[PDB]
Amino acid sequence: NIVMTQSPKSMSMSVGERVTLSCKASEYVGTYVSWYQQKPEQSPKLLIYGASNRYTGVPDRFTGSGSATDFTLTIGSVQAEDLADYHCGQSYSYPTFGAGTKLEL
Amino acid sequence: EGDVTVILNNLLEGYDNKLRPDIGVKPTLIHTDMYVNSIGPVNAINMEYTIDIFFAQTWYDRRLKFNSTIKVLRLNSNMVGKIWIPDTFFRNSKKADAHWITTPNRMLRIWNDGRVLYTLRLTIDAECQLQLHNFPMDEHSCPLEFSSYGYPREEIVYQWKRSSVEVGDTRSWRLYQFSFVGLRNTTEVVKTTSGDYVVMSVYFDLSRRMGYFTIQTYIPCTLIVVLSWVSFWINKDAVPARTSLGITTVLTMTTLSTIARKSLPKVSYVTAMDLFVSVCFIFVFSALVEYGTLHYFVSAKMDSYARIFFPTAFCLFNLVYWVSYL
Amino acid sequence: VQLQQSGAELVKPGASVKLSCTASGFNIKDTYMYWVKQRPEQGLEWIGRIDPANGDTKYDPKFQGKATITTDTFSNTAYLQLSSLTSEDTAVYYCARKGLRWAMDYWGQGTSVTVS
Amino acid sequence: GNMSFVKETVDKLLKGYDIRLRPDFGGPPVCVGMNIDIASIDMVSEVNMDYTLTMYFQQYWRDKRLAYSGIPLNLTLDNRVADQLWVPDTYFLNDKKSFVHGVTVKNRMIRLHPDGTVLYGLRITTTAACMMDLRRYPLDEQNCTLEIESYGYTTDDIEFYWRGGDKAVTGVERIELPQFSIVEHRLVSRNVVFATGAYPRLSLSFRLKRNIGYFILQTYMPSILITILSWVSFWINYDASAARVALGITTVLTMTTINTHLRETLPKIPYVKAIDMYLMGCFVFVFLALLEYAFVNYIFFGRVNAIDRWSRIVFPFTFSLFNLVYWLYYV
Amino acid sequence: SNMSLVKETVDRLLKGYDIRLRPDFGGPPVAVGMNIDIASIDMVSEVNMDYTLTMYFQQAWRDKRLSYNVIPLNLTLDNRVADQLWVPDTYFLNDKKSFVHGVTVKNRMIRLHPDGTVLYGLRITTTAACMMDLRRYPLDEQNCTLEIESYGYTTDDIEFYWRGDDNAVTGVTKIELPQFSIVDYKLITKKVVFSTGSYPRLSLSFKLKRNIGYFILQTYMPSILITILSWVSFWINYDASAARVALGITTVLTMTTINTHLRETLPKIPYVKAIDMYLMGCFVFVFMALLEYALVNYIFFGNAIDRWSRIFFPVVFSFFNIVYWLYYV
Amino acid sequence: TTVFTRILDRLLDGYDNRLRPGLGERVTEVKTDIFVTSFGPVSDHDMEYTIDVFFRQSWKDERLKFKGPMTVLRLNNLMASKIWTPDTFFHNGKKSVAHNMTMPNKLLRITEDGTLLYTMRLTVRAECPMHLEDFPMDAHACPLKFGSYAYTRAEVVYEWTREPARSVVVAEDGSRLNQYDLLGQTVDSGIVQSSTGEYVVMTTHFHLKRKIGYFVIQTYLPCIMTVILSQVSFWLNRESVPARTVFGVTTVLTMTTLSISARNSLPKVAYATAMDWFIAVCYAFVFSALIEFATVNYFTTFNSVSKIDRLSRIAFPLLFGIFNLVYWATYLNR
Amino acid sequence: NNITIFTRILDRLLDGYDNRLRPGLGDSITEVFTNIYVTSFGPVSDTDMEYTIDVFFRQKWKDERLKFKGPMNILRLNNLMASKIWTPDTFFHNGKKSVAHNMTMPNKLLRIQDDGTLLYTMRLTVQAECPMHLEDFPMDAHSCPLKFGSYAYTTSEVTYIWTYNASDSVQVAPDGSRLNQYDLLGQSIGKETIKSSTGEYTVMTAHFHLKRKIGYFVIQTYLPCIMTVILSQVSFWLNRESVPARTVFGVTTVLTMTTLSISARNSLPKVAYATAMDWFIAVCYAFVFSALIEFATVNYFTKSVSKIDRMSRIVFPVLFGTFNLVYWATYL
Ligand SMILES: *[C@@H]1O[C@H](CO)[C@@H](O[C@@H]2O[C@H](CO)[C@@H](O[C@@H]3O[C@H](CO[C@H]4O[C@H](CO)[C@@H](O)[C@H](O[C@H]5O[C@H](CO)[C@@H](O)[C@H](O)[C@@H]5O)[C@@H]4O)[C@@H](O)[C@H](O[C@H]4O[C@H](CO)[C@@H](O)[C@H](O)[C@@H]4O[C@H]4O[C@H](CO)[C@@H](O)[C@H](O)[C@@H]4O)[C@@H]3O)[C@H](O)[C@H]2NC(C)=O)[C@H](O)[C@H]1NC(C)=O
Ligand SMILES: CCCCCCCC(=O)OC[C@H](COP(=O)(O)O[C@@H]1[C@H](O)[C@H](O)[C@@H](OP(=O)(O)O)[C@H](OP(=O)(O)O)[C@H]1O)OC(=O)CCCCCCC
Ligand SMILES: *[C@@H]1O[C@H](CO)[C@@H](O[C@@H]2O[C@H](CO)[C@@H](O[C@@H]3O[C@H](CO)[C@@H](O)[C@H](O)[C@@H]3O)[C@H](O)[C@H]2NC(C)=O)[C@H](O)[C@H]1NC(C)=O
């Protein structure tokens, strides 16, 4: 199967600076990753599709990037309402998911 | 105009080109005629010959009967695809095509009683049989069989005209190694799975001229084996010179065997040229082993024997070889 | 445009539970329907696949046999069947619509199952 | 009123005729029988893996919209009405480049029988693809097939069968490819399954053993006579260095050239053939003769007749052993 | 709905349209802008004296009969309507074989802007004739041209101009050829005068420079090395006749076989090339080396003279090599 | 059969085939999959490859919806030209033929909800750019990029109908590759921008690998035997001048004629392949034999065995073996 | 609009025009005035005895039904009108593979004048036959013709006349010639009347005189044949007792002369007759073949410098020198 090994588990920084994520693929997935957010007591919502395509309603601060194997999501000036958990998925094969990257103060 | 176009519109109204004339009455008698422009090159490795003709057909159609003051209606190719045409195809043509520059090269003339003269220009690659035996002296009868496709003997009957087949000057023709000997028309009925069809065959008698092959492989191999016998006039103590002459002669004989086969198609049987090549080789190999055994002995008068014996042994072969093949 | 699911369920272990979600505003014959498992304080785990136009289903190897997905055309609804419920099956389930470039576009509100 | 009726009848039949619908569109599948009158395999080139096949492909089915009653004769219409009738979509799966002959008119036949049965014949030249195994070249036999399949209609819409069991294909024996020789034709009817459905498939395949006498005359005899000559090197006296080195070197250069010239009418196969194994064995024999001379000279002028007498016996004895093995195995 | 409105708008546009008449037929000539996106340049062959070019050929003109205002959006129609609208008869003068690609449909584009601008695009693979001067081969540089011209309309009816200066022709710098290298390209607008009138013409040219490494690897260095082998014979003693004449004969036959072997692939041009000068230059030094033995075998049988040829022959070959390379490069 | 005929006529009545489905309300997505029936031969000279496919496209049309006793209308080819079809073209195709023997090889199935299907038989000759630095022990990624021609990203988008790992299927019997072998399919979806606008392009990478069976019999093995042929010249009588001479001159001729075939096979690239480096090193090791013999002949009571010959009997084959163990390991094993 | 007026004129013109009938069918002949702007004398294929041309085939005739008096003088129309008005059925008698370019639009021209004159310009790639007698090869000078005439109408219905006089009718592009083997000396044209089995047809010919440049065969064929004759004459300058070496020289030369024969034999149609090239190789072979006979005579008499060897150093070069003066003056 396709194994998602997104790192790290959580990052604890303040409001108004740049924070980036990472999603590493075991096998080749070609620009088919997806990023979602997970608030407590809330269903996931889509953020990024393809490799770096901004969904409707996503703010411009959420910037993604993609490649053949390495994938990342860069957040510019993260605010207080963005403190949630992020999930990295793939759909080049039957879909799998990562562990989940949280955010803290 | 005025008068001619209403005659044509009166002919072509209520006309079905899908149905042949006399569909349920009698077979349609079609008089064919051919004028050969030039016969192209006869390809030997691929077994066909190119031919360029003016294929002309003549029949009757009672629907195309107009009573007027104009007797002959010389018309262009824009009216070909509106009346009936027999589906004459060439049964041994690998590929063929009409010429379409600057207009479709088709002629259509209608007489007032119903004669439809359809004539088109064709370039045909017709498959021909090459015995390939006795090469380079082979005489072939290259055929050209044409018939209707869908219509059997009960519906289309073909017939030639006494002087139907006409040829060019045979001087502008593209035969290089061949010569146009003669022609013979014919006709027969073949039986297939859909019915009986009338097939007309034109046989073109071709014979190979006496050029090229001789300068190509005969004169070089004969001069090579003549040069193989100058070793016998070299003294017996000059071992490396005579064996260098020997190896160069046998490797050139093998190379000339390989080169002359490239002009020959991939046939399984042996030809006369390959027989000559093999005899030339068994002669040069016999010369090399004779020089060996003479050198082996001295380590005695066979060298003086070989200066007269080997020119004679090849010359008696030549008179046998040519006369039995001429 | 809205995926409405069923309510929360609480049954004994070893039993079977019927779980469903209803899609509205479109038809499920066009896009695939994806089921997913979210264990509390864990990551998402994909359950299976269903193509309602063809009826073809594909499942994860670890969820084969204990779970299957069914569908119907008139009600425009997707269904889950769960068999041999255990303690590790206590999670929340979502049904995901296939989106643009295979992105899991829409999500349901979530049905939490609990065993005792 | 023959011409008159034979007109209106065709006029009525093709009116209201929907060409987009097969016969029995909402019902049982139609049965498209087939027979082929093979004319000649133009060429069987191994370089492009293909055999040009000229044939008189002939389809056969029964359309109930084209059944004429009044007229009692098999109507052979002009070939251009076939663009206004439904015709089965037969396609060749291993086709590469093919055409229907178009001189002097398109070479196709239409024939309406009074029970509606449609006889449709076409003259077709297919350059079908035939992947070959050259592991035993030139002492090989090949199996070249011609796949006949319907494209758009599944087995719930069309059915294929050979008309006449094993008598459907004819004149197959008549074809005489200059290099090969047909051993047996076979007729196979299948159903293949794709992702879009299950399609009917008629299959025609020939077995082509290769005539070997051309091959001997062109490669097997020069490659043997070269070693035969090499064997002269041993006999020559030991002090004649120039003659023996010239002979062996010449034979080696010949064996090396013979090979390259051959590997030009063969595809870039990554394996060794039978003829390559033979040429490699003859090269080893010629190389061993030259190395035998190296040993003889190095032994006398480097510190002899017994070694040269032993190699004069062993070398023709071992080459006849290898020759026998090769021939028996590959025949 | 909107689809019926677009349907009746297009049906109104093509009702009464005369394809046989150009826009503004009785008035001023129509201006036809052009721009080319080059896909690749495949086979620049000197045997047939042509090059194969694949391009995205766009055209843009104005047609007041095709002005719609009902839809405020560019109408990108299907590729099959282009046979029902007027197009310019643009042809290439140096064409030999050209075809528009027809998989899966005919690869053409037509787009109807609301003002009346029509953007007509095509994917054309052409084999344009490019007459070459192979007098400095293989160190030469070529000038291959494409001659875009109108056929049936003179300068009083049509006007050709590049759309937006040198920004018209794009994608040239990413074209990768095996043996050449694109140095420069230039765009020329000119008016040629034939017997039937004066016709506008857009000339697109190329500056192909030939890479040398293949020809050094194949022709120049084996000739140099077989010329090096010819001077080994100056060290073998004079009385060893067979070795020295084998050394002469083998490299003489090698030089003439390389000379006749690297030319039948080339065309049958009647002048001499730079590689042909070097092969004739190397054959002179090889033939004089065998004649050097022919002199010394006649003086003795019929040590100073071959010692002088041991030093003079590599020097005068080195002198000939510097004169050859600095003149031609 | 008139019941189906009036259904088809009602579908085609008032149908404008010049307009895509939903021109001003929605993006007309196209679901695409490829069934590769035969991956044909790869021609190195033209840097191209031939592929025979069953290219299928499926899209939603709301005008072609019918209510009848049959759910799926497997219609004939004619129906295909009278309805809208996407103008899918190959971005790197050179010359591709849509087969039409005997009938046009097309398919058209209209389901009752308006969903279409359009299968087609093609033989695409596409560009495969090759970097022959590691010839012949190289691996390529020959692409095949299709996409719309006239419709931009805002009008027609493309997608795979199955999972992208399972949307390109290669038949098991369908491998006409005689030189290479296919190591697996690879797809990707992206957006490309041109002078007109931004277009959706779908890329199919085919991974290949050259099998070293043709060149290990044609080039490597005859050059190794050519070097070995020169290696036996050090075991020859010091006095035998024409013999060692002929050995050398011929080895040098076989070495220079053997290189010709190498450049004769591959295209005229500017750089040097790894086989060319093998040719060069074998040439150096065969042309040093003549230098050694010329030194012996310059340095030639009877004569003695030269020390140069006794050193060259050992040094030259071990240097050749060391070069082989370097070259073959470095290129083949990495 | 003025464009609507022109649409009306075009429609009226075609309302009654029958394209199956020539102008003045019941009347006299339709005089087609032909013209040819040669743009590129393509390459001459020596193997197939054919040559390629690229012409601007301008035709011109008078059709009284296509007469107009609208607000224009010349109606420079497009290609679609030509598919529906008369068009002389000109075909090339010797043309093997003539093809009309179709990129982008059909390369055709139609200019209906006010008085009824028409102009019809096409762009062709005619591949006409050329009968070549390569006996003086390669000092030959061919004349490749190009005969075009009607295929359906006789001389009593359509007559073809050159628009201009002399040969001006065919103006060869000053820089239009793909002849790497030949060069175009000039053109000569004429009009004949050929009678066949269906009648007389007016045939116009255009002879293009060619002349083969010797320069390719001076570097490829002649000089490597000359130098190996000089190479074969080195054997007379060596020692008498040097059998190995002189034998080598001999068996080598002959081989490179025989090798130089095959490529030439192949670089020409396999005609039964021989060429002037073969009468140079055979004599140069005979000089080389007699050199080995000379050494065999010396080796027959050996056991000093041979007098036969000293006389062969003078007789053999001056016999070759006088042969080249005879051969290069008869054919030049
Ligand atoms: C599979 O697909 C291929 C490609 O689509 C099809 O091949 C094409 O098929 C069409 C339809 O049959 C052909 O159209 C016709 O072409 C006639 C001229 O053909 C010649 O010129 C073309 C180039 O212009 C060449 O490609 C042709 O070469 C091919 O055909 C020859 C036949 O001998 C072969 O030998 C070759 O190997 C090639 O295969 C030819 O050289 C053209 O005249 C014709 O147009 C007439 O009819 C239409 C309709 O009625 C009129 O509108 C039009 O005005 C013409 O009418 C005039 O001419 C007719 C005689 O033709 C007269 O009777 C009239 O009175 C009037 O004067 C039409 O356009 C097309 O040429 C062909 N091309 C190729 C590349 O093969 C296959 O058929 C198809 N196979 C199947 C089974 O479906
Ligand atoms: C490409 C390499 C080129 C190397 C070129 C190397 C050139 C170089 O240095 O030559 C000198 C010498 C020649 O030795 P070689 O054995 O060839 O020659 C003997 C030597 O000259 C003796 O001195 C002679 O005896 P004398 O004194 O007259 O009584 C004897 O004559 P005779 O007694 O038989 O009558 C000669 O045969 O070689 C070495 O010492 C080995 C070097 C190995 C170098 C490394 C080689 C790999
Ligand atoms: C390749 O060859 C072509 C043609 O031989 C060269 O094109 C030439 O380019 C120059 C520079 O623009 C042209 O000069 C200009 O011509 C225009 C014509 O209107 C004039 O207005 C300018 O004032 C200027 O004189 C020249 O005409 C043109 N040659 C031809 C025959 O048109 C080209 O430079 C060559 N090199 C490259 C790298 O393309």
Please give the sequence-ordered ranges of beta strands (E in DSSP) within C1-116, or none if there are none: 2-5, 9-11, 17-24, 33-38, 44-51, 56-59, 67-72, 77-82, 92-97, 111-115
Residue nearest to ligand 2 atom 25, measured at CA = F304
Residues of chain G in contact with residue E269, where contact means CB-CB under 8 angstroms, are 180, 216
Phi, psi (rounded to 5 degrees) for D86: -75, 130
Helix, strand and coil in chain G, % to nearest 5: 35, 25, 45
Using alpha carbons, select from D9, D154, D20, D158 the residue that is nearest to residue F2.
D20
Q: Which CATH number fits domain D214-330: 3.30.365.10, 3.40.47.10, 1.20.58.390, 1.10.287.70?
A: 1.20.58.390
Q: Across the interface, do G239 and E151 touch by the CB < 8 Å criterion? A: no
Residues of chain F in contact with residue C100, where contact means CB-CB under 8 angstroms, are 157, 159
H helix or E strand, kind and range, residue E61? strand E50-62
For the A4-103 domain, the top CATH level (class) is: mainly beta
E203 in Cβ contact with E93 (< 8 Å): no
Q: Across the interface, do A92 and F163 touch by the CB < 8 Å criterion? A: yes
G256 in Cβ contact with G243 (< 8 Å): no
Cα–Cα distance, B25 to B219 (Å, whole number): 67
Scored b (16 or more CB within 10 A) or e, E259-278 reads: bbebbeeebbbbeebbbbeb
Query: How many C-beta neighbours within 10 Å does residue C61 have?
Result: 8
Residue among D21, D245, D294 whose CB faces F1 most closely: D21
DSSP string, F103-154: S--B-EEE-TTSB--EEEEEEEEEE----GGGTTS---EE--EEEESS--TT
SS3 B41: strand
C104 in Cβ contact with C12 (< 8 Å): no
Tokens for G306, please give them: 């041979």
Q: Is G121 labelled a binding residue?
A: yes
Using alpha carbons, select from B92, A73, D89 the residue that is nearest to residue F80.
D89
- CATH 2.70.170.10 for the D2-211 domain, yes or no: yes
Residues of chain E in contact with residue G71, where contact means CB-CB under 8 angstroms, are 26
CB contacts under 8 A, D 198-227 vs F, are none
CB contacts under 8 A, F 74-113 vs C, are 113
Cα–Cα distance, D2 to B25 (Å, whole number): 8
Cα–Cα distance, G214 to D96 (Å, whole number): 45
Cα–Cα distance, D37 to D123 (Å, whole number): 9
- Computed on alpha carbons and rounded to an integer, the radius of gyration of chain E in Å comes to 31
Residues of chain F in contact with residue A30, where contact means CB-CB under 8 angstroms, are 164, 186-189
- CATH 1.20.1080.10 for the G215-330 domain, yes or no: no
Q: Which residues contact B97 (CB under 8 A, 6 or more apart)?
A: B122, B123, D102, D103
Q: Which amino acid is at F15?
A: Y
Q: Which amino acid is at G104?
A: T
Cα–Cα distance, G142 to G145 (Å, whole number): 10
DSSP tag of B186:
-
Cα–Cα distance, D101 to A4 (Å, whole number): 59
**Could you give the dihedral angle defined by the CA atoms of residues E234, E235, E241 and E245, in that order, rounded to the nearest 10 degrees?**
-50
Using alpha carbons, select from F146, F156, F162, F189 the residue that is nearest to residue F60.
F156
Chain D contact partners (≥3 CB pairs within 8 A): B, F
Phi, psi (rounded to 5 degrees) for F75: -85, 175
Q: Is G58 labelled a binding residue?
A: yes
G186 in Cβ contact with G128 (< 8 Å): no
Residue among A34, A94, A98 whose CB faces C104 most closely: A34
E153 in Cβ contact with E89 (< 8 Å): yes
Residues of chain F in contact with residue E162, where contact means CB-CB under 8 angstroms, are none
Task: Write out the binding residues of D for 4-aminobutanoate.
Answer: 91, 149, 151, 196
Q: Strand A96-97 to strand A85-90: parallel, antiparallel, or no bridges (unpaired)? A: antiparallel
Tokens for D178, please give them: 């200059």
- Looking at the CA of residue E190, tell me the nearest atom of ligand 3: 19
Cα–Cα distance, D207 to D181 (Å, whole number): 8
Residue nearest to ligand 1 atom 4, measured at CA = F100
C108 in Cβ contact with C94 (< 8 Å): yes
* F292 Cβ inside 6 Å of ligand 2: yes
Place of tokens 């064409």: E95
Using alpha carbons, select from D265, D264, D269 the residue that is nearest to residue D210.
D265
DSSP tag of A4:
B
Cα–Cα distance, G59 to G34 (Å, whole number): 5
Q: Which CATH number fits domain G2-210: 1.10.580.10, 3.20.20.80, 2.70.170.10, 1.25.40.10?
A: 2.70.170.10
Q: Across the interface, do E58 and F195 touch by the CB < 8 Å criterion? A: yes
Cα–Cα distance, E41 to E24 (Å, whole number): 37
Cα–Cα distance, D170 to D206 (Å, whole number): 12
CA of E177 to the centre of ligand 3 (A): 24
Q: Which CATH number fits domain C2-115: 2.60.40.10, 3.40.1010.10, 3.10.350.10, 2.30.110.10?
A: 2.60.40.10
Using alpha carbons, select from F311, F297, F292 the residue that is nearest to residue F230.
F292
Domain E213-328 fold: Methane Monooxygenase Hydroxylase; Chain G, domain 1 (1.20.58)
- Looking at the CA of residue D122, tell me the nearest atom of ligand 1: 82
Residue among G37, G78, G181 whose CB faces E152 most closely: G78
Cis peptide before E29 (omega within 30 of 0): no
Tokens for G287, please give them: 């000089």
SS3 G218: helix
Query: How many C-beta neighbours within 10 Å does residue F205 have?
Result: 18
Q: Is D164 exposed, middle or buried (0-12, 13-18, 19+ CB in 10 A)?
A: middle
Q: Strand G32-36 to strand G160-162: parallel, antiparallel, or no bridges (unpaired)? A: parallel
G160 in Cβ contact with G190 (< 8 Å): no
Distance from CA of D194 to the nearest CA of B (A): 34
DSSP string, G300-323: HH-----HHHHHHHHHHHHHHHHH
Q: Across the interface, do A94 and C58 touch by the CB < 8 Å criterion? A: yes
- Provide CATH code, domain E2-210: 2.70.170.10
As a residue count, chain G comes to 332
For C9-15, which contacts have Cβ atoms below 8 Å and span 24 or more sequence positions? C9/C111, C9/C112, C9/C113, C9/C114, C10/C113, C10/C114, C10/C115, C10/C116, C11/C85, C11/C113, C11/C115, C12/C85, C12/C115, C12/C116, C13/C85, C13/C86, C13/C87, C13/C115, C13/C116, C14/C84, C14/C85, C14/C86, C15/C85
* Alpha-carbon separation of residue B23 from B27, B28, B87, G251 (angstroms): 8, 8, 15, 78
Cα–Cα distance, F104 to F77 (Å, whole number): 7
DSSP tag of G137:
T
Report all structural domains of chain B as residue ranges with CATH numbers, in order of start.
3-208 (2.70.170.10), 213-325 (1.20.58.390)
A100: left (phi over 0), alpha (psi -120 to 50) or beta: left
- In this complex, whether A and B touch, counting 3 or more CB pairs under 8 angstroms, is no
Cα–Cα distance, G15 to G42 (Å, whole number): 43
* F38 Cβ inside 6 Å of ligand 2: no
Q: Which amino acid is at A57?
A: G
Cis peptide before F136 (omega within 30 of 0): yes
Q: G239: number of CA atoms within 13 Å, CB side? A: 18
Q: Which residues contact C1 (CB under 8 A, 6 or more apart)?
A: C24, C25, C26, C106
DSSP string, G191-206: EEEEEETTEEEEEEEE
Q: Which CATH number fits domain F215-332: 3.20.20.105, 3.10.180.10, 3.40.50.2300, 1.20.58.390?
A: 1.20.58.390
CA of E188 to the centre of ligand 3 (A): 6
CB contacts under 8 A, E 48-67 vs G, are 49, 57
Ligand 2: residue of F233, F306, F320 to mutate (most ligand atoms within 8 A of CB) is F306
- Looking at the CA of residue E191, tell me the nearest atom of ligand 3: 19
B151 in Cβ contact with B22 (< 8 Å): no
Q: D268: number of CA atoms within 13 Å, CB side? A: 20
Q: Which amino acid is at F131?
A: H
Q: Where are the domains of chain G?
A: 2-210, 215-330
Q: Where are the domains of chain E?
A: 2-210, 213-328
Q: Which residues contact F223 (CB under 8 A, 6 or more apart)?
A: F255, F258, F278, F279, F282
Pocket residues: Cβ below 6 A from ligand 3: E 143, 184, 186, 188-190, 203, 205, 207
SS3 E121: strand
- Computed on alpha carbons and rounded to an integer, the radius of gyration of chain C in Å comes to 14
Q: Which residues contact D35 (CB under 8 A, 6 or more apart)?
A: B193, D58, D60, D162, D163, D164, D168, D169, D170
